[PDB]
Write a protein that binds this ligand. Structure first.
Ligand SMILES: [Au+]
Ligand SMILES: [Au+]
Ligand SMILES: [Ca+2]
Ligand SMILES: [Mg+2]
Ligand SMILES: [Mg+2]
Length: 397
């Protein structure tokens, strides 16, 4: 292909990065600043002062006794009028009963907390939902929407394997529509047009994931040092940017995150910078639009975003028929990030070409491609659970 990638291990001034300390204290900040200014926009603050956590419901015998279910309003200021998000948490009762804290999978959902499981006790979101959401009515959730996205969320299996499940609807943070930033937590945090380097939806979604982690640190049922942050597609772009910016996340999973997630942009294949910015002008910074039809001018590529997770375990995965996300570009980004993981003594996929379907490859830096179209399937999750068992931080040292 007709591109050349910037080297993560060459600093902005030309000096080679030879050691883990130089990586962590000099090169990581350089790369975080480039992604903030040129791609996602600047995250203007981390935890806001005055965050308030309210447990609104608590069920100790959910899912027929298998789980404790908690709903938590995370309000971003002390005034009752301040914006908030609604977190849903299922915790495996087997782990609670042993008086042990559970590790956690955390990720955003597309259409509302009530869509991840049929469970009729989940609060029905009252927020705007996209027309694509199954069983909506005038952009609001209906009772028939309950469990409408459960295929992406094997809650019972995740719990049986010893992990809690935490989720938040992405639209609590920024509604996924081209004008959504004006009704987002970003609008709350003197003029009206956002600045060239202002964050978009991906940055806002990623920030919400870190705010969910702030909540998890206070919950006695879970171990917030053992959180795997995950996402599918656009929500996987957010998971990657969250895990790169916030090194408290212990493990990061990108399920088919594609353009502006794991796929190289300088490889012109499937979705391009111009296409993503034209269709989704709210997702990235306005500055990213400088690279429409000009990916050769990008000063970073997505292999460097993957490298910002090192040395923490990172899983990138693709679907065989998902040409728009550019599976080969996702794999080649993993290979181009591998030298940074190797600096930290980790290993990535063995081969130099895309592995065969359903044969994951790599150590703490892992890749698989599964048959079929864009989505997030039981096979994806089976592989993610094996990876978390092996590579997620232990309850011990
Ligand atoms: Au992109
Ligand atoms: Au692209
Ligand atoms: Ca592409
Ligand atoms: Mg029940
Ligand atoms: Mg700690």
């Amino acid at each position: 292909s007709a591109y050349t990638l910037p080297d993560p291990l060459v600093g902005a001034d030309g000096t080679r990065v030879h050691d883990r300390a130089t990586w962590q204290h000099r090169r990581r900040p350089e790369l975080l600043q480039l992604f903030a200014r040129e791609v996602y926009g600047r995250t203007p603050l981390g935890r806001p002062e005055g965050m308030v956590f309210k447990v609104t419901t608590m069920e100790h015998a959910a899912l027929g006794g298998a789980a404790t279910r908690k709903e938590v309003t995370v309000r971003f200021g002390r005034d009752p009028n301040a914006p908030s998000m609604q977190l849903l948490l299922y915790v495996p009762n087997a782990v609670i009963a042993r008086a042990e804290r559970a590790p956690v999978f955390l990720g955003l959902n597309f259409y509302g907390n009530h869509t991840v499981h049929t469970d009729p006790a989940i609060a029905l979101s009252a927020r705007w939902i996209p027309a694509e959401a199954p069983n909506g009515a005038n952009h609001r959730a209906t009772e028939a929407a309950r469990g409408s996205d459960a295929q992406k969320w094997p809650v019972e299996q995740i719990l049986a394997r010893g992990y809690a499940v935490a989720t938040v609807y992405c639209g609590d943070l920024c509604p996924d529509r081209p004008d959504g930033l004006n009704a987002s937590v970003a609008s709350w945090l003197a003029g009206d047009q956002r600045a060239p380097d202002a964050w978009g939806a991906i940055g806002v979604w990623a920030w919400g994931l870190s705010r969910a982690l702030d909540y998890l640190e206070t919950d006695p049922l879970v171990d917030a040092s053992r959180v795997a942050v995950h996402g599918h597609s656009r929500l996987g772009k957010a998971a990657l940017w969250a895990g790169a910016q916030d090194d408290r996340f212990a493990l990061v999973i990108s399920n088919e995150s594609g353009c502006g997630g794991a796929a190289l942009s300088k490889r012109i294949h499937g979705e391009t910078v111009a296409r993503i910015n034209t269709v989704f002008p709210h997702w990235f910074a306005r500055n990213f639009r400088r690279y429409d039809d000009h990916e050769e001018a990008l000063p970073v590529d997505q292999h460097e975003l993957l490298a910002l997770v090192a040395p923490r375990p990172l899983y990138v995965a693709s679907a065989e028929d998902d040409d728009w996300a550019d599976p080969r570009g996702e794999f080649l980004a993993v290979k181009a990030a591998e030298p940074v993981f190797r600096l930290f003594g980790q290993t990535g996929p063995s081969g130099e070409d895309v592995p065969r379907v359903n044969e994951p490859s790599g150590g703490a830096l892992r890749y698989h491609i599964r048959p079929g179209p864009h989505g997030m399937t039981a096979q994806d999750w089976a592989f993610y659970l094996a990876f978390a068992d092996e590579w997620l931080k232990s309850a011990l040292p």
